[PDB]
Design a protein around this ligand. Structure first.
Ligand SMILES: *[C@@H]1O[C@H](CO)[C@@H](O)[C@H](O)[C@H]1NC(C)=O
Lengths: 50, 48
């Protein structure tokens, strides 16, 4: 699973089966890292109009 | 793939299904790859 974003700590209480999370657009918003099983939130990097 | 979903609920109703809502979490996924059209419940006898 590929993508770009800032990985931060999260407070979303994922259930044991649950691995990733999806927004309305279906783009991945949170992910569970292998090897260490922790839950990393994925926040898109800051952008806007010049 | 044999998907088993499970949920354990404390109830106190005597005879029928209690009326309420409880979403079943996934328990296990088994790669059995076999044809299934019929199934059986297994019970346990009590002997004295
Ligand atoms: C390796 O990944 C497994 C998950 O499949 C995990 O249980 C285990 O702790 C990991 N070990 C190391 C050394 O990262």
């Amino acid at each position: 699973l590929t993508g770009t974003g800032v990985l931060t700590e999260s407070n979303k209480k994922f259930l044991p089966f649950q691995q990733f999370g999806r927004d309305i657009a279906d783009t991945t918003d949170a992910v569970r890292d292998p090897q260490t099983l922790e839950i990393l939130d994925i926040t898109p990097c800051s952008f806007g109009g010049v | 793939y044999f998907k088993i979903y499970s949920k354990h609920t404390p109830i106190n109703l005597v005879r029928d299904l209690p009326q309420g809502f409880s979403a079943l979490e996934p328990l296990v996924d088994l790669p059995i790859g076999i044809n299934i059209t019929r199934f059986q419940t297994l019970l346990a006898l009590h002997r004295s």
